[PDB]
Amino acid sequence: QSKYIGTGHADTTKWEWLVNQHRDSYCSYMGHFDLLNYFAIAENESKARVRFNLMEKMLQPCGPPA
Amino acid sequence: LNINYNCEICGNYTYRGPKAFQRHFAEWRHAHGMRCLGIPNTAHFANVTQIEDAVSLWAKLK
């Protein structure tokens, strides 16, 4: 369980849980080709610049911890 | 109980019982010293006494 990421425990902080689901949101968005294309259409960029941006936002999302 | 003991990370505090120490570890102030020290909470650090060793342990964590 532990070496399988996204594992929680009862000490789980708010922040960590949410950052988790962010990241996983992302590897989905890189995953599901369409969903990606959806984003691309909406906010006009490349597919690439999308994926790139995302892979920037990976570690950050929500901003610094507490 | 009523046996001399000391926790180093907490104010070099004194504890009179060994059962008391586990309770101190699952504690508000003990976790405040850890987390505010930069050593994050819960169950990996339980056996801590001195401030120094758990710093390299936390470097092993991250």
């Binding site: 399988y4 996983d24 892979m55 950050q60 | -």
Partner: protein
Amino acid sequence: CRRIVPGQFLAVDPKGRAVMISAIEKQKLVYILNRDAAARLTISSPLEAHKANTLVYHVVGVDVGFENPMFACLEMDYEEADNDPTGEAAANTQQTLTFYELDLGLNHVVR
């Protein structure tokens, strides 16, 4: 689609010997290939590159003709980025290029 399970990025050698496969994060495995007795393609057993808390931007087969093969894992660690209450490690981390190196004879894979 996982965060940790391969199939996302995929790379493979010029000489076809071995092929590396990877998720986005944490897992990079490698399957070696050699044609059978009759030269029909037999698949090796896997291997593992595991490295904790490491983002793989992109992977590419490498060229070394008839060597121990190489791969390029573009990486970044976020582990600095978590344990920085400030938000400095947010900046001032640079993505780490590493070449992994298959090694047949020893048959593991070494950073």
